[PDB]
Amino acid sequence: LFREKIPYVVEMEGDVEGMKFSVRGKGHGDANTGKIEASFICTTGELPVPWSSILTTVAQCFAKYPNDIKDYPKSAMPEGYVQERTITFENDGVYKTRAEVTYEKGSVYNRVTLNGSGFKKGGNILGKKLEFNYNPHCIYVLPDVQNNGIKCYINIVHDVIGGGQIIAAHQQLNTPLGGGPVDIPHYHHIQAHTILSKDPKETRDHMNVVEVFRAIDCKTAYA
Amino acid sequence: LFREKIPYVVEMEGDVEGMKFSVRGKGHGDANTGKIEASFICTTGELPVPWSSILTTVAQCFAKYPNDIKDYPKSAMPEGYVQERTITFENDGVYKTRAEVTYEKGSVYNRVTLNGSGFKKGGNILGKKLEFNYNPHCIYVLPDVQNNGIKCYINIVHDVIGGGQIIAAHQQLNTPLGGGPVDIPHYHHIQAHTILSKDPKETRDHMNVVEVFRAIDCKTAYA
Numbered sequence: 001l002f003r004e005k006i007p008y009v010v011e012m013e014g015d016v017e018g019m020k021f022s023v024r025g026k027g028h029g030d031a032n033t034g035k036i037e038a039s040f041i042c043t044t045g046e047l048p049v050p051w052s053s054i055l056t057t058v059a060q061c062f063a064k065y066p067n068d069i070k071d072y073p074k075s076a077m078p079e080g081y082v083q084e085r086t087i088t089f090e091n092d093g094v095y096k097t098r099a100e101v102t103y104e105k106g107s108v109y110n111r112v113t114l115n116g117s118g119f120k121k122g123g124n125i126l127g128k129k130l131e132f133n134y135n136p137h138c139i140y141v142l143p144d145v146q147n148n149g150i151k152c153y154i155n156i157v158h159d160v161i162g163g164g165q166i167i168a169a170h171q172q173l174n175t176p177l178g179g180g181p182v183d184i185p186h187y188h189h190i191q192a193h194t195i196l197s198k199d200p201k202e203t204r205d206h207m208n209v210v211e212v213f214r215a216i217d218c219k220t221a222y223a
Numbered sequence: 224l225f226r227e228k229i230p231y232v233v234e235m236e237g238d239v240e241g242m243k244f245s246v247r248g249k250g251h252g253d254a255n256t257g258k259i260e261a262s263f264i265c266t267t268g269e270l271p272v273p274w275s276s277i278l279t280t281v282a283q284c285f286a287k288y289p290n291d292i293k294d295y296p297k298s299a300m301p302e303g304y305v306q307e308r309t310i311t312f313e314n315d316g317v318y319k320t321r322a323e324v325t326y327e328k329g330s331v332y333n334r335v336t337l338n339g340s341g342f343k344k345g346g347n348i349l350g351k352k353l354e355f356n357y358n359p360h361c362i363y364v365l366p367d368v369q370n371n372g373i374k375c376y377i378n379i380v381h382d383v384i385g386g387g388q389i390i391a392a393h394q395q396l397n398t399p400l401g402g403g404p405v406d407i408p409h410y411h412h413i414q415a416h417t418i419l420s421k422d423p424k425e426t427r428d429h430m431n432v433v434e435v436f437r438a439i440d441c442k443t444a445y446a
Binding site: 135136137138140142143145153155157163164165167169187189191192193212214218219221222223 | 358359360361363365366368369376378380386388390392410412414415416435437441442444445446
């Protein structure tokens with residue numbers, strides 16, 4: 001199912017303090033390498049929040065997994081899985097997100113909704129004061145047998161224009177869309193690395209993305 | 224002054240919901256390997272909270288640093304540095320801690336105070352329902368030039384007796400005790416690995432620790 005590089009499609013609807021927007025993305029994921037390359041367009045005009053703020057919201061199934069850690073997202077495929085997050089920004093509001101990640105017609109689809117509230121008028125998010133770049137991160141993956149899934153935790157470091165960084169605290173739940181058996185792993189990490197870029201020839205508000213996700217058995221590797 | 228294995232001494236005073244306690248530790252740290260081995264005794268009787276809950280509170284200077292990342296804690300030595308943390312436990316209270324980490328008489332000293340409040344009667348902390356073990360973790364180290372130091376973020380995964388895990392969210396600030404020059408690094412990670420043990424011959428409430436800390440230039444290493 002993930003033996004080859006395969007197409008990745010994203011359909012996102014957002015609403016942040018009443019500002020509605022749509023994002024569409026197309027790219028590929030290669031679970032052999034853990035690499036994602038995708039292009040995102042805001043199809044409703046100007047994105048009303050920083051691109052970096054929605055990077056995590058816009059495919060964990062593409063992560064490079066070794067044989068000796070259960071791969072919950074790939075196990076939930078092809079019927080797929082629900083990915084829910086609360087993202088709380090330092091001194092600012094929260095994104096609540098609900099995604100359905102499915103395998104259809106040789107492609108992975110990430111169809112995701114986002115609501116934002118509690119954001120400050122001239123803060124880093126509504127003021128769009130975050131740099132257009134990204135930092136590498138460590139994703140925590142924990143078993144959640146009670147929910148037939150995994151709970152994940154991430155701190156995201158956002159670089160602020162003119163110096164400084166803020167944290168976006170991520171709480172994440174992945175549960176199955178199917179009725180099939182799922183593989184629920186022991187606690188481990190996913191190393192994340194992300195380069196954001198623009199196409200100079202692209203006139204629409206956009207974000208291009210090159211990502212690497214590698215699962216690490218930290219109980220062994222950090223010893 | 225970190226070229227050799229050197230002694231490590233810890234003096235901790237705690238107050239959680241009015242329960243006062245003292246912890247003393249002795250061991251060594253080796254910054255060549257990133258290894259800490261130390262023994263902790265509660266000198267006031269029974270520890271009123273889980274040992275694992277105070278593991279992070281009871282020497283980042285011992286972490287194994289490569290040449291290409293600035294080592295803030297070693298740079299602050301020998302006058303040393305202040306380590307402040309807010310630790311907020313899932314569905315439970317918060318530890319506020321202030322440490323002074325110094326080099327005196329051939330030894331690293333961690334003299335640290337802890338206050339706990341907002342804890343639930345019969346919860347995982349006051350009920351001591353956390354397992355006597357520890358998980359590996361990823362420490363985020365960020366520059367904080369405004370404070371002549373570093374800000375660090377950690378999620379700690381605590382295993383609960385009889386199954387389950389909770390998160391202890393760590394916010395950490397390190398500032399100098401001296402007026403000397405300090406080395407403030409770019410954003411990077413410290414991989415942490417910790418094994419807890421008891422001495423069968425020890426009659427006092429106690430915790431022995433073997434730890435490995437390695438700084439990783441994640442901007443490069445995760446690519």
